[PDB]
Design a protein around this nucleic acid. Structure first.
Lengths: 98, 91
DNA sequence: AAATTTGTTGGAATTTTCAGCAAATTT
DNA sequence: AAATTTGCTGAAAATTCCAACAAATTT
């Protein structure tokens, strides 16, 4: 058969453990760590934008990467991401990617 | 300089920050590599799902389970927050 | 030359706000 | 005892999907 690949392990980033041994770990944990870190620096004023802040950090590379893959093809990229070609175009504007 | 970053370490044992986006980019770089021309059908909802769960989890620690403050912090309507917590079944 | 993708549309579908309950929980 | 937060609700405000089209482009 094929071995299970939980959704945690579909998008993973290389890390190193205490034994200088290279190993994948969920992207989840990077996002978890970035926030953990982000909160440390909150000393300690309010935020009103943490979603759109995060979303923007994640949307940019996704678009960046998908557009490279589809060699610039908008129709394919929007079909890959499961978003309408119109909203893809809109996002691409948002990030000056056109 | 830049608010969302994660700790890295180089061969010379020096810890050093890099922006989260660089890791998201790597994640995909990899994801694509392994697919050999296989359809990718719903990649947005995928990556969204991978980011919202940590984000929700973490703010609900910071707000101490307080749904109301978390929503104002994240900048989405309190109802949405509940609706998203349901999506991932954290409640 | 044909097939596809782009840029633009007006409308329909769905998602998120928003204020306003009383009831329940925290202070 | 008071203040805050929750679980819920309609309905408005915004965003997303749609699908169709000529025109630009890629095959």
């Amino acid at each position: 058969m094929f071995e299970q690949r939980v959704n945690s392990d579909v998008l993973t980033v290389s890390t190193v453990n205490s034994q200088d041994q290279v190993t994948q770990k969920p992207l989840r944990d990077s996002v978890k760590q970035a926030l953990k870190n982000y909160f440390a620096q909150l000393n300690g004023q309010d935020v009103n934008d943490l979603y759109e802040l995060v979303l923007a950090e994640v949307e940019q590379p996704l678009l960046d990467m998908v557009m490279q893959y589809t060699r610039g093809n908008q129709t394919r990229a929007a079909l890959m991401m499961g978003i309408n070609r119109g909203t893809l175009r809109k996002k691409l504007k948002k990030y000056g990617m056109n």
